[PDB]
Design an enzyme around this catalytic site. Sequence first.
Site, PDB file in Angstrom:
ATOM      1  N   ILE A 183       2.340  -3.968  14.715  1.00  0.00           N
ATOM      2  CA  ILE A 183       1.043  -3.417  14.439  1.00  0.00           C
ATOM      3  C   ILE A 183       0.891  -3.003  13.139  1.00  0.00           C
ATOM      4  O   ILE A 183       1.511  -2.391  12.337  1.00  0.00           O
ATOM      5  CB  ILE A 183       0.841  -1.994  15.366  1.00  0.00           C
ATOM      6  CG1 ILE A 183       1.225  -2.333  16.842  1.00  0.00           C
ATOM      7  CG2 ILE A 183      -0.515  -1.663  15.179  1.00  0.00           C
ATOM      8  CD1 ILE A 183       1.173  -0.849  17.343  1.00  0.00           C
ATOM      9  N   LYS A 239       6.209   5.345   3.261  1.00  0.00           N
ATOM     10  CA  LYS A 239       5.716   6.743   3.452  1.00  0.00           C
ATOM     11  C   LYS A 239       5.045   6.986   4.648  1.00  0.00           C
ATOM     12  O   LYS A 239       5.194   7.756   5.649  1.00  0.00           O
ATOM     13  CB  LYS A 239       5.231   7.506   2.248  1.00  0.00           C
ATOM     14  CG  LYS A 239       4.538   8.957   2.620  1.00  0.00           C
ATOM     15  CD  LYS A 239       5.417   9.916   2.758  1.00  0.00           C
ATOM     16  CE  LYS A 239       5.050  10.907   3.513  1.00  0.00           C
ATOM     17  NZ  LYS A 239       5.788  12.282   3.386  1.00  0.00           N
ATOM     18  N   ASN A 296      -4.632  -5.372  12.942  1.00  0.00           N
ATOM     19  CA  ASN A 296      -5.270  -4.111  12.807  1.00  0.00           C
ATOM     20  C   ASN A 296      -5.530  -3.930  11.583  1.00  0.00           C
ATOM     21  O   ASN A 296      -6.542  -3.167  11.145  1.00  0.00           O
ATOM     22  CB  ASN A 296      -4.553  -2.821  13.504  1.00  0.00           C
ATOM     23  CG  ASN A 296      -5.375  -1.698  13.313  1.00  0.00           C
ATOM     24  OD1 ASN A 296      -6.486  -1.313  13.616  1.00  0.00           O
ATOM     25  ND2 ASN A 296      -4.604  -0.835  12.303  1.00  0.00           N
ATOM     26  N   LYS A 309       1.158 -16.390  11.945  1.00  0.00           N
ATOM     27  CA  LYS A 309       1.826 -17.880  11.571  1.00  0.00           C
ATOM     28  C   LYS A 309       3.294 -17.368  11.969  1.00  0.00           C
ATOM     29  O   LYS A 309       4.003 -18.285  12.437  1.00  0.00           O
ATOM     30  CB  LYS A 309       1.572 -18.008  10.248  1.00  0.00           C
ATOM     31  CG  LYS A 309       2.244 -19.171   9.757  1.00  0.00           C
ATOM     32  CD  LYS A 309       1.596 -20.735  10.375  1.00  0.00           C
ATOM     33  CE  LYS A 309       2.559 -21.816  10.357  1.00  0.00           C
ATOM     34  NZ  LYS A 309       3.626 -21.600   9.133  1.00  0.00           N
ATOM     35  N   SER A 361     -11.680  -7.374  15.901  1.00  0.00           N
ATOM     36  CA  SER A 361     -12.969  -7.734  15.203  1.00  0.00           C
ATOM     37  C   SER A 361     -13.776  -6.125  15.305  1.00  0.00           C
ATOM     38  O   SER A 361     -13.237  -5.318  15.013  1.00  0.00           O
ATOM     39  CB  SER A 361     -13.662  -8.597  16.178  1.00  0.00           C
ATOM     40  OG  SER A 361     -14.963  -9.275  15.358  1.00  0.00           O
ATOM     41  N   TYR A 384     -16.879  -7.763   5.192  1.00  0.00           N
ATOM     42  CA  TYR A 384     -16.258  -7.146   6.341  1.00  0.00           C
ATOM     43  C   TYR A 384     -16.745  -8.089   7.830  1.00  0.00           C
ATOM     44  O   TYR A 384     -15.901  -8.108   8.625  1.00  0.00           O
ATOM     45  CB  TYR A 384     -16.313  -5.851   6.576  1.00  0.00           C
ATOM     46  CG  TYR A 384     -15.962  -4.865   7.695  1.00  0.00           C
ATOM     47  CD1 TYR A 384     -14.845  -4.598   7.752  1.00  0.00           C
ATOM     48  CD2 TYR A 384     -16.987  -4.533   8.692  1.00  0.00           C
ATOM     49  CE1 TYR A 384     -14.330  -3.894   8.834  1.00  0.00           C
ATOM     50  CE2 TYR A 384     -16.602  -3.982   9.873  1.00  0.00           C
ATOM     51  CZ  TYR A 384     -15.207  -3.601   9.927  1.00  0.00           C
ATOM     52  OH  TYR A 384     -14.700  -3.058  11.099  1.00  0.00           O
ATOM     53  N   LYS A 437     -14.187 -10.097  10.208  1.00  0.00           N
ATOM     54  CA  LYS A 437     -14.248  -9.800  11.547  1.00  0.00           C
ATOM     55  C   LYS A 437     -14.956 -10.688  12.477  1.00  0.00           C
ATOM     56  O   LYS A 437     -14.288 -11.097  13.589  1.00  0.00           O
ATOM     57  CB  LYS A 437     -14.897  -8.470  11.886  1.00  0.00           C
ATOM     58  CG  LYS A 437     -14.055  -7.132  11.025  1.00  0.00           C
ATOM     59  CD  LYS A 437     -12.801  -7.087  11.162  1.00  0.00           C
ATOM     60  CE  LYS A 437     -12.286  -5.783  11.409  1.00  0.00           C
ATOM     61  NZ  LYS A 437     -10.725  -5.691  11.359  1.00  0.00           N
ATOM     62  N   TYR A 456     -10.108 -24.397   9.674  1.00  0.00           N
ATOM     63  CA  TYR A 456     -11.467 -24.814   9.778  1.00  0.00           C
ATOM     64  C   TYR A 456     -12.455 -23.929  10.463  1.00  0.00           C
ATOM     65  O   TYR A 456     -13.651 -23.437  10.382  1.00  0.00           O
ATOM     66  CB  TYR A 456     -11.452 -26.361   9.898  1.00  0.00           C
ATOM     67  CG  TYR A 456     -13.087 -26.859  10.267  1.00  0.00           C
ATOM     68  CD1 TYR A 456     -13.667 -27.420   9.071  1.00  0.00           C
ATOM     69  CD2 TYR A 456     -13.688 -27.273  11.603  1.00  0.00           C
ATOM     70  CE1 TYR A 456     -15.125 -27.775   9.162  1.00  0.00           C
ATOM     71  CE2 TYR A 456     -15.041 -27.689  11.558  1.00  0.00           C
ATOM     72  CZ  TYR A 456     -15.595 -28.062  10.518  1.00  0.00           C
ATOM     73  OH  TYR A 456     -16.983 -28.742  10.353  1.00  0.00           O
TER      74      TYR A 456
END
EC number: 4.2.1.119
Length: 582
Positions: A12, A40, A86, A119, A137, A151, A155, A455
């Site tokens: 995550i 941290k 995320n 990847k 998204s 943004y 998204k 693409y």
Amino acid sequence: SPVDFKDKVVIITGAGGGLGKYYSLEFAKLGAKVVVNDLKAADVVVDEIVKNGGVAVADYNNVLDGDKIVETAVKNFGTVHVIINNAGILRDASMKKMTEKDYKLVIDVHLNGAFAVTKAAWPYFQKQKYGRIVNTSSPAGLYGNFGQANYASAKSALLGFAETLAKEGAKYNIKANAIAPLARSRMTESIMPPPMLEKLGPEKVAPLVLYLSSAENELTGQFFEVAAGFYAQIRWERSGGVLFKPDQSFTAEVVAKRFSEILDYDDSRKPEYLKNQYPFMLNDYATLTNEARKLPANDASGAPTVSLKDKVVLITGAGAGLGKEYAKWFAKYGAKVVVNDFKDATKTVDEIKAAGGEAWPDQHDVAKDSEAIIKNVIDKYGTIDILVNNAGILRDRSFAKMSKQEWDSVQQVHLIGTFNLSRLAWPYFVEKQFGRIINITSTSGIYGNFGQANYSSSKAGILGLSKTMAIEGAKNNIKVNIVAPHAETAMKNLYHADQVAPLLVYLGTDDVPVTGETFEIGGGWIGNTRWQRAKGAVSHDEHTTVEFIKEHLNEITDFTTDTENPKSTTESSMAILSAVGG
């Protein structure tokens, strides 16, 4: 027995807080081995996990260093099974204020970080024949949103990326999906009552995320809205469309005559090949053009006048191929056409002028030199009215072998270049309260397509970008529309550029009555593309579980009744209020 996650290794990104931190805790509660990534902060989350009986390790890397993140999972746990994309970051600004750097930064974290991490996860998914990817998204990705041009671009890109991974991944048992969680904002807080606003948080998102991240999940390539107990699938609905005879009579004026038919979703009286679809790829063009060619000549009687006289059109990647022809259409309708091309704009210019039209060359690189292109236009014709962002390259490769160079260069031309040029045209458009932007998307961006992760992601970036720019443009009479052509060149022809260009010049007129809209087009066919959102399920409990998603999946994926067709974040939020309101 419950939905199982035991011993699944789960990366995550941006997991130091908010949604990412919550997922880390929930996954680990269910026996998963979590890689908590945060640039941290990660340590703080990793300590709670271990203290409360779980397995987790921290990773401190930048999401661009996706290889190192996954390297963390592999060292500690021997593989990876789940990626939760995320990690984020906001640099909100209107199109007036937003800089190039504000744009590339937000694309980098949301989109290019996902590419880097995924990847790197991909070989391991392939070898074990298992993977689960969730791309985060947002409604702004689906619909566009004022002040979030970046943004929304990132998204929205992540939609097409998810579809592509789902297609390439199927044979390896890798499934990829996107969620679009509604956030607390000024808009939401003005639409939704205090009790729903306090359910508008990670506790109500995580169940769907866990579910979609599990072995039991069969859903792939799919998008979902999620908010305060609500969960609903949202898919593409492409209109039945219209057929034009693909001959000389197929003019810009016939489109204008029949324009409303394109956006008309009442398909009762149409035949089977022109009924509304809920697609996963481009249309059946062979059937469509076949039928279009049986038609009599397009009747232009009563058609609106179409003229681009004394409008300055700037079109990019128009030195050859499809773009060259598009330009020649813009010029024949009376526009002074600045023909941009990285290699050679000369031949298009010569051909335009040999037909009695006016055109002027530009040979700057779009991504790099948007400033020099805008100056070139202004120096020559004094102004700009129409921007057709057509520049392109193709660097096709399986996702397993796609290099970073292949990823970026495609991105730079299609997505970045479209923004950077659009941003510098913009102040001229608003100053004269006129602008017509025509951005070229692709069915490979809309539906995804194996071998084209770069693409497709980029062209899907275009949807979010365009839609935003349409919201912001409306008050200054700046309209921006999106087009996914199917046409070939030479390298008979049933899908000519002549079968696409007519729509393009109509989109440039004063009286084009829509904005923010998406069209697919080729072979004599034109259709529109929109959202259909499912009935959806509503959890009323104050704790919602992954089990709720499992047991109410039928309702989440139910397009048989109570569907919606949202086209703005306001429309979606009102509809969600209504379903939750009961």
